[PDB]
């Protein structure tokens, strides 16, 4: 049987440095305030998400 190892001789911390991160996404629809419709835009002036 043939195994395979990859060792970070510099420092064990680099074993995690390379596979670092894990920032899962958590966005959701920003319902508009006027008609409560699913927002499709973002007014550059107000920054408020609107749909109509």
């Amino acid at each position: 049987c043939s195994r395979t190892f990859i060792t970070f001789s510099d420092d064990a911390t680099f074993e995690e440095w390379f596979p670092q991160g894990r920032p899962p996404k958590v966005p959701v629809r920003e319902v508009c305030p006027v008609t409560h419709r699913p927002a499709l835009y973002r007014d550059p002036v107000t920054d408020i998400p609107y749909a109509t």
Partner: peptide, 27 residues
Amino acid sequence: RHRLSRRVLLEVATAPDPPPRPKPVKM
């Protein structure tokens, strides 16, 4: 639909408009 007829160009020659400055915080 938007051929930009002649007179529209003559009218656009008016002085320009000022830019906005958006910094609102509310619902």
